[PDB]
Design a protein around this ligand. Structure first.
Ligand code: ZJT
Length: 258
């Protein structure tokens, strides 16, 4: 009667508690995943029954405010959230996705669909800040949780809401998709620091869809054409094969193989 729920709190969070959380998120994302090959592939969108389509991530903080993000199991992305008696959804791209989200938070009194999508380019415009200048860490996540909650009371303006989504999406969705990004967050929690993501993180995020294609279309693990990534100092290199990415990318959006 309800989708799977994973709980996390910034209150007293540790390296261990955040590692447990991301491991549980990946576990729920991959109940229907294809795990026969080198890297897990998320369930195919087409033909996926609506009762397997979403998972819920319930966040709380030191103020004991709580919000619940809905994640699409087909791409691990945040499609909307619930705060109190209100639910808020990004603009869906097509009618089928708009129908699927009517199955979320079906008890709330107030449902709203934003005019805008939840992709980074749009959220950065709304926030007035690029990912490069938005700090990540337990502190930022705590503030993001309160901002998301108080959106429902009128206490949060849209630019701060957008910045809060950018923080949640990176620390949950992208940490679930990439062991590399989970490790970046782990280091921030470990040393109690808040800091913006370096170019290696931003380029991996921008590349997740392209990597998913390059990998699932590989022949004997070899890419058809290289894809370029960045080091933490911004220098660029190419990857040509699946194996080197096994430790880096934990989940892939389904893609067709010829
Ligand atoms: O800062 C550094 O020295 C490095 C940053 C990255 C490295 S190395 C890497 C190597 C091979 C891959 F398939 C993927 C990545 C992710 C980004």
């Amino acid at each position: 009667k309800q989708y799977p729920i994973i709980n996390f709190t910034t209150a007293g969070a540790t390296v261990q508690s955040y590692t447990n959380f991301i491991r549980a998120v990946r576990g729920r994302l991959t109940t229907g995943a294809d795990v026969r090959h080198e890297i897990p592939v998320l369930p195919n969108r087409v033909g996926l029954p609506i009762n397997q389509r979403f998972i819920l991530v319930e966040l709380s903080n030191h103020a004991e405010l709580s919000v619940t993000l809905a994640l699409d199991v087909t791409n691990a992305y945040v499609v909307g959230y619930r705060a109190g008696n209100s639910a808020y959804f990004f603009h869906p791209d097509n009618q089928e996705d708009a129908e699927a989200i009517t199955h979320l938070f079906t008890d709330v009194q107030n449902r709203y669909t934003f005019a805008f999508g939840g992709n980074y380019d749009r959220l950065e415009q709304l926030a007035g800040n690029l990912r490069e200048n938005i700090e990540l860490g337990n502190g930022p996540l705590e503030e993001a949780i309160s901002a998301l909650y108080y959106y429902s009371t009128g206490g949060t303006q849209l630019p701060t809401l957008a910045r809060s989504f950018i923080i949640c999406i990176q620390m949950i969705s992208e940490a679930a998709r990439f062991q590399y990004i989970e490790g970046e967050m782990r280091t921030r929690i470990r040393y109690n620091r808040r800091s913006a993501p370096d170019p290696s993180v931003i380029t991996l995020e921008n590349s997740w869809g392209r990597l998913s294609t390059a990998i699932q279309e590989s022949n004997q693990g070899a890419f058809a054409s290289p894809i370029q990534l960045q080091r933490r100092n911004g220098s660029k290199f190419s990857v040509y094969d699946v194996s080197i990415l096994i430790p880096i990318i934990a989940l892939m959006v389904y893609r067709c193989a010829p």
